[PDB]
Design a protein around this nucleic acid. Structure first.
Ligand code: VT7
Ligand code: CL
Ligand code: CL
Ligand code: MG
Ligand code: NA
Ligand code: NA
Ligand code: NA
Length: 326
DNA sequence: CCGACAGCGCATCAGC
DNA sequence: GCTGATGCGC
DNA sequence: GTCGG
């Protein structure tokens, strides 16, 4: 939090560009700038100083100068006064409402939390559950609660079939003292890049987690990706825990290391690392790392037997999960 | 100056 | 129905 | 919005 003021301002700008302008490159530029400044280990004294960092250019440098001189940004002060922008921004805080639906709702006079509740029939399923847990989904998850949730998930997965491996990723695997949701990577020897010798591998786990009333709602679900809602059990007379977002990603077991790399993140770390792989002539996704030929077409999967193997290919020294919080 | 910006699962819709 | 584009969110 | 070539 050395430069928390600056990185808050850049984040609010990124959200403005994504949600209101629908200019996704400005949104990623602002977030990259915010990220490179959050890890800069000096208290920034001028835009010139910040311009030296990659991702901060002239425009952001001027904005930082204004913010340092005045403590605020006039552009953001006007944005906060604009009722249309404020309405659109607020609606995207509901899970499943992105910039397009937010502007659609605002155009029809659906602009507050009450309005969504009275127009629940204009929402799709995901958006309906997002509204239902709107307040809970804004709460952070203490790591101590993440530890209880992991113990349930792993034990219930083990009960379905002892050959499953479930791995909690996200910021929890990076060591964070609090997480926004739970991200679970799942493998089973029956599911490899060569064959799926067992159907319903993800369904069986989801079902068992619903049976014990851990999973409470479903946002979306397919053969390899589940997104939904869970809740820890409370003791007698105790207030209930908040409802929590849970994502489960079933990945072919022989592709575990690209999967765990992807699911551990952060998202900006993935973007940097994947960008760097391109510069080095490779493409990385959650399944494989592949060379790119002279035509930039993805070649065949390269052998991977560790996270570090993926770093080696692109000539990065290995970074532990705790150092990928970008 | 300007092309590229990481990569992809699931939900929904439009055209057929 | 399937196919492709778009939305949304990892 | 930023930047590598
Ligand atoms: C959102 C996002 C996620 N990911 C990867 C990287 C994340 O760490 C992983 C889990 O997504 P997440 O939205 O739960 O992020 P997170 O890192 O776990 C988090 F720190 F944002 P939080 O703990 O609050 O969920 O999916 C991407 O590669 N691209 C993305 O755009
Ligand atoms: Cl843009
Ligand atoms: Cl792998
Ligand atoms: Mg997460
Ligand atoms: Na710079
Ligand atoms: Na949203
Ligand atoms: Na997640």
């Amino acid at each position: 939090t050395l430069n928390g003021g600056i990185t808050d301002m850049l984040t609010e700008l990124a959200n403005f560009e994504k949600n209101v302008s629908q200019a996704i490159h400005k949104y990623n530029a602002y977030r990259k700038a915010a990220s490179v400044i959050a890890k800069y280990p000096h208290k920034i004294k001028s835009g010139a100083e910040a311009k030296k960092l990659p991702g901060v250019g002239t425009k952001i440098l001027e904005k930082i100068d204004e913010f340092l001189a005045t403590g605020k940004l006039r552009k953001l002060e006007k944005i906060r006064q604009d009722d249309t922008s404020s309405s659109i921004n607020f609606l995207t805080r509901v899970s499943g409402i992105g910039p397009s639906a937010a502007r659609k709702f605002v155009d029809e006079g659906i602009k507050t939390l009450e309005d969504l509740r009275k127009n629940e029939d204009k929402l799709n399923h995901h958006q309906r559950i997002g509204l239902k847990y709107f307040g809970d989904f804004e709460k952070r998850i203490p790591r101590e609660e993440m530890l209880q949730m992991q113990d349930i998930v792993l034990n219930e997965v083990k009960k379905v079939d002892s050959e499953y491996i479930a791995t909690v990723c996200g910021s929890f695997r990076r060591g964070a003292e609090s997480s926004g949701d739970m991200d679970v990577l799942l493998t089973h020897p029956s599911f490899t890049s060569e064959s799926t010798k067992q159907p319903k591998l993800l369904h069986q786990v989801v079902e068992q987690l619903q049976k014990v009333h851990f999973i409470t709602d479903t946002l979306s679900k397919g053969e390899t990706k589940f997104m939904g809602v869970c809740q820890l059990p409370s003791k007698n007379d105790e207030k209930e825990y908040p409802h929590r977002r849970i994502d489960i990603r079933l990945i072919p077991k022989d592709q575990y290391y690209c999967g765990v790399l992807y699911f551990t993140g952060s998202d900006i770390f993935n973007k940097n690392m994947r960008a760097h792989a391109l510069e080095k002539g490779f493409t990385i996704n959650e399944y494989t790392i592949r060379p790119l030929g002279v035509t930039g077409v993805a070649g065949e999967p390269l052998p991977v037997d560790s996270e570090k193997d993926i770093f080696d290919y692109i000539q990065w020294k290995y970074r532990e999960p705790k150092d990928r919080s970008e």
